Design an enzyme around this catalytic site. Structure first.
Site, PDB file in Angstrom:
ATOM      1  N   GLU A 178      66.173 -13.854 -39.215  1.00 52.29           N
ATOM      2  CA  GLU A 178      66.083 -15.215 -39.957  1.00 52.29           C
ATOM      3  C   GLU A 178      64.646 -15.774 -40.130  1.00 52.29           C
ATOM      4  O   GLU A 178      64.154 -16.547 -40.749  1.00 52.29           O
ATOM      5  CB  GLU A 178      66.672 -16.372 -39.312  1.00 52.29           C
ATOM      6  CG  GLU A 178      68.391 -16.412 -39.356  1.00 52.29           C
ATOM      7  CD  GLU A 178      69.070 -17.573 -38.613  1.00 52.29           C
ATOM      8  OE1 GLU A 178      68.278 -18.185 -37.940  1.00 52.29           O
ATOM      9  OE2 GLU A 178      70.339 -17.698 -38.773  1.00 52.29           O
ATOM     10  N   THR A 223      61.974 -12.517 -47.408  1.00 52.59           N
ATOM     11  CA  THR A 223      61.334 -13.512 -48.162  1.00 52.59           C
ATOM     12  C   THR A 223      59.878 -12.999 -48.730  1.00 52.59           C
ATOM     13  O   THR A 223      59.412 -13.057 -49.702  1.00 52.59           O
ATOM     14  CB  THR A 223      61.312 -14.796 -47.888  1.00 52.59           C
ATOM     15  OG1 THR A 223      62.567 -15.185 -47.181  1.00 52.59           O
ATOM     16  CG2 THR A 223      60.959 -15.905 -48.796  1.00 52.59           C
ATOM     17  N   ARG A 263      69.373 -16.616 -48.978  1.00 40.84           N
ATOM     18  CA  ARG A 263      69.629 -16.116 -47.765  1.00 40.84           C
ATOM     19  C   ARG A 263      70.432 -14.906 -47.921  1.00 40.84           C
ATOM     20  O   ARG A 263      71.590 -15.094 -48.398  1.00 40.84           O
ATOM     21  CB  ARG A 263      69.832 -16.891 -46.746  1.00 40.84           C
ATOM     22  CG  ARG A 263      69.484 -16.483 -45.167  1.00 40.84           C
ATOM     23  CD  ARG A 263      70.524 -16.528 -44.274  1.00 40.84           C
ATOM     24  NE  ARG A 263      70.185 -16.079 -42.926  1.00 40.84           N
ATOM     25  CZ  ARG A 263      70.182 -14.932 -42.839  1.00 40.84           C
ATOM     26  NH1 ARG A 263      70.651 -14.005 -43.408  1.00 40.84           N
ATOM     27  NH2 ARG A 263      69.923 -14.386 -41.357  1.00 40.84           N
ATOM     28  N   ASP A 292      61.190  -3.120 -44.753  1.00 42.19           N
ATOM     29  CA  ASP A 292      61.819  -4.163 -44.236  1.00 42.19           C
ATOM     30  C   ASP A 292      63.153  -3.684 -43.410  1.00 42.19           C
ATOM     31  O   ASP A 292      63.661  -2.982 -43.688  1.00 42.19           O
ATOM     32  CB  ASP A 292      62.228  -4.960 -45.473  1.00 42.19           C
ATOM     33  CG  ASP A 292      62.702  -6.360 -45.260  1.00 42.19           C
ATOM     34  OD1 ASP A 292      63.276  -6.550 -44.268  1.00 42.19           O
ATOM     35  OD2 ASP A 292      62.102  -7.370 -45.957  1.00 42.19           O
ATOM     36  N   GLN A 319      68.414  -8.860 -36.464  1.00 45.09           N
ATOM     37  CA  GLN A 319      69.550  -9.279 -35.485  1.00 45.09           C
ATOM     38  C   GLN A 319      69.287  -8.284 -34.273  1.00 45.09           C
ATOM     39  O   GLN A 319      68.824  -7.165 -34.301  1.00 45.09           O
ATOM     40  CB  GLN A 319      70.577  -9.131 -36.130  1.00 45.09           C
ATOM     41  CG  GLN A 319      71.172 -10.250 -37.159  1.00 45.09           C
ATOM     42  CD  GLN A 319      70.747 -11.678 -36.555  1.00 45.09           C
ATOM     43  OE1 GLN A 319      71.501 -11.793 -35.412  1.00 45.09           O
ATOM     44  NE2 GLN A 319      70.405 -12.370 -37.541  1.00 45.09           N
TER      45      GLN A 319
HETATM   46  N1  LIG Z   1      61.215 -23.418 -46.268  1.00 42.91           N
HETATM   47  C1  LIG Z   1      61.047 -22.012 -45.921  1.00 42.91           C
HETATM   48  N2  LIG Z   1      62.162 -21.139 -45.930  1.00 42.91           N
HETATM   49  C2  LIG Z   1      61.686 -19.787 -45.663  1.00 42.91           C
HETATM   50  C3  LIG Z   1      60.731 -19.324 -45.411  1.00 42.91           C
HETATM   51  N3  LIG Z   1      60.579 -18.179 -44.954  1.00 42.91           N
HETATM   52  C4  LIG Z   1      61.902 -17.649 -45.313  1.00 42.91           C
HETATM   53  N4  LIG Z   1      62.810 -18.807 -45.533  1.00 42.91           N
HETATM   54  C5  LIG Z   1      64.307 -18.780 -45.805  1.00 42.91           C
HETATM   55  O1  LIG Z   1      64.673 -18.396 -44.687  1.00 42.91           O
HETATM   56  C6  LIG Z   1      66.036 -17.324 -45.059  1.00 42.91           C
HETATM   57  C7  LIG Z   1      66.020 -16.320 -44.311  1.00 42.91           C
HETATM   58  O2  LIG Z   1      64.933 -15.400 -44.528  1.00 42.91           O
HETATM   59  P1  LIG Z   1      65.409 -13.773 -44.502  1.00 42.91           P
HETATM   60  O3  LIG Z   1      65.024 -13.405 -45.909  1.00 42.91           O
HETATM   61  O4  LIG Z   1      66.554 -13.617 -43.924  1.00 42.91           O
HETATM   62  O5  LIG Z   1      64.145 -13.217 -43.609  1.00 42.91           O
HETATM   63  P2  LIG Z   1      64.502 -11.842 -42.625  1.00 42.91           P
HETATM   64  O6  LIG Z   1      65.697 -12.305 -41.684  1.00 42.91           O
HETATM   65  O7  LIG Z   1      63.242 -11.459 -41.712  1.00 42.91           O
HETATM   66  O8  LIG Z   1      65.233 -10.802 -43.609  1.00 42.91           O
HETATM   67  C8  LIG Z   1      65.829 -17.299 -46.675  1.00 42.91           C
HETATM   68  O9  LIG Z   1      66.956 -17.842 -47.260  1.00 42.91           O
HETATM   69  C9  LIG Z   1      64.421 -17.903 -46.923  1.00 42.91           C
HETATM   70  O10 LIG Z   1      64.707 -18.909 -47.974  1.00 42.91           O
HETATM   71  C10 LIG Z   1      59.484 -20.389 -45.307  1.00 42.91           C
HETATM   72  O11 LIG Z   1      58.235 -20.178 -44.902  1.00 42.91           O
HETATM   73  N5  LIG Z   1      59.782 -21.617 -45.673  1.00 42.91           N
HETATM   74  F1  ALF Z   2      67.664 -12.356 -42.440  1.00 33.87           F
HETATM   75 AL1  ALF Z   2      67.498 -10.712 -41.306  1.00 33.87          AL
HETATM   76  F2  ALF Z   2      67.187  -9.713 -40.034  1.00 33.87           F
HETATM   77  F3  ALF Z   2      67.531 -12.091 -39.875  1.00 33.87           F
HETATM   78  F4  ALF Z   2      67.585  -9.896 -42.829  1.00 33.87           F
HETATM   79 MG   LIG Z   3      65.836  -9.565 -44.490  1.00 32.58          MG
END
Ligand SMILES: Nc1nc2c(ncn2[C@@H]2O[C@H](COP(=O)(O)OP(=O)(O)O)[C@@H](O)[C@H]2O)c(=O)[nH]1
Ligand code: ALF
Ligand SMILES: [Mg+2]
Length: 317
Positions: free
Chosen positions: A12, A17, A146, A168, A172
């Site tokens: 998360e 993003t 997301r 990427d 989790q």
């Molecule tokens: N408001 C805001 N939302 C964010 C930011 N960075 C990520 N998000 C939100 O967090 C959600 C989950 O992020 P994600 O893409 O799953 O990151 P990951 O888990 O590393 O792959 C996404 O739907 C984004 O829209 C930020 O800097 N600001």
């Molecule tokens: F949004 Al994730 F690993 F937490 F891709």
């Molecule tokens: Mg992701």
């Protein structure tokens, strides 16, 4: 030829993003078919948020203000996103009534007690436009969707004069054990930490604070012996979330050691940055940090403008 990068962080945090932002700026912008597909993604995100907050209301036993919407609430429980389609008329009115319901609004304001997407408020504000049949999501809507990533996904890309391939990975806990294979020839590591994770616990665990897990993972990554020759960059993402969470939540309760003044977003950000940089074992190592917000294109542009230069200076060959 092309240098390998990693985007690491807890789930998360916002890695995907940042990948989207990098593609948008130094890659290919998303097409009309992309947005058409993302419309359904936004639809199931909204449905998932609605179901999650109703379930939270039920578990917390918070009474509702609108008796009629209760029926809709039951209908909400019946909606299943496995056999999903486009949003229908009977659902838009129910969602609007629920969101306008003060009781569920208070429940969401108490969102710290359960998992929830940070994009819920944005979509709720969008309301009819997103739910309108003539759905033409903008770049912001696509960015603020997301979709849990899983498995290693190499994203080839290049700068104006050099080629830097990104990687990427999922955040989790169950999935982190798949990173073993992507560490082969890392040239520099980008680490993402949610500045607003200090208030919310993990998803896989409902007792451990997210920030503690992020700090532990950062320490584990820095401790890696074979990364000694690779630079590390600590992107402090979701500053726009923290500037409001701190105003609404006291950082003392999460980490009492932060004895700084309350309501100071800059003070809290500096405290978090110092706490994270302290985890390094040996001071000879250098850690570069940048406050950012993946949802804003300008911030990513500014950060990357210097990240690329730092990476290029780090590796002269
Ligand atoms: N408001 C805001 N939302 C964010 C930011 N960075 C990520 N998000 C939100 O967090 C959600 C989950 O992020 P994600 O893409 O799953 O990151 P990951 O888990 O590393 O792959 C996404 O739907 C984004 O829209 C930020 O800097 N600001
Ligand atoms: F949004 Al994730 F690993 F937490 F891709
Ligand atoms: Mg992701």
């Amino acid at each position: 030829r092309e240098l390998k990068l990693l985007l690491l962080g807890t789930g998360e945090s916002g890695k995907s993003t940042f990948i989207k932002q990098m593609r948008i700026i130094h890659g290919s912008g998303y097409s009309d078919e992309d947005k058409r597909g993302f419309t359904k993604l936004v639809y199931q995100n909204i449905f998932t948020a609605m179901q999650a907050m109703i379930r939270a209301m039920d578990t917390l036993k918070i009474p509702y203000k609108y008796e009629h919407n209760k029926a809709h609430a039951q209908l909400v429980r019946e909606v299943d996103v496995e056999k999903v389609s486009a949003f229908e008329n009977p659902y838009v009115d129910a969602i609007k009534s629920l969101w306008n319901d003060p009781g569920i609004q208070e429940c969401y304001d108490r969102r710290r007690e359960y998992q929830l997407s940070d994009s819920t408020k944005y979509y709720l504000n969008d309301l009819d436009r997103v739910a309108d049949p003539a759905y033409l999501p903008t770049q912001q809507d696509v960015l603020r969707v997301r979709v849990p990533t899983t498995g290693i996904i190499e994203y080839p890309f290049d700068l104006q004069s050099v080629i830097f391939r990104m990687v990427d990975v999922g955040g989790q806990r169950s999935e982190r054990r798949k990173w073993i294979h992507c560490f082969e020839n890392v040239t520099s590591i980008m680490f993402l930490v949610a500045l607003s994770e200090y208030d919310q616990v993990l998803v896989e665990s409902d007792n451990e604070n997210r920030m503690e897990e992020s700090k532990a993972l950062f320490r584990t990554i820095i401790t890696y012996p074979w990364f000694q020759n690779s630079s590390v960059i600590l992107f402090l993402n979701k500053k726009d979330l923290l500037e409001e969470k701190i105003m609404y939540s006291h950082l003392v309760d999460y980490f009492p050691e932060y004895d700084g003044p309350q309501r100071d977003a800059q003070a809290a950000r500096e405290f978090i940055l110092k706490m994270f940089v302290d985890l390094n074992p040996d001071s000879d190592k250098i850690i570069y940090s940048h406050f950012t917000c993946a949802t804003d294109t300008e911030n990513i542009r500014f950060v990357f403008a210097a990240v690329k230069d730092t990476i290029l200076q780090l590796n002269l060959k």
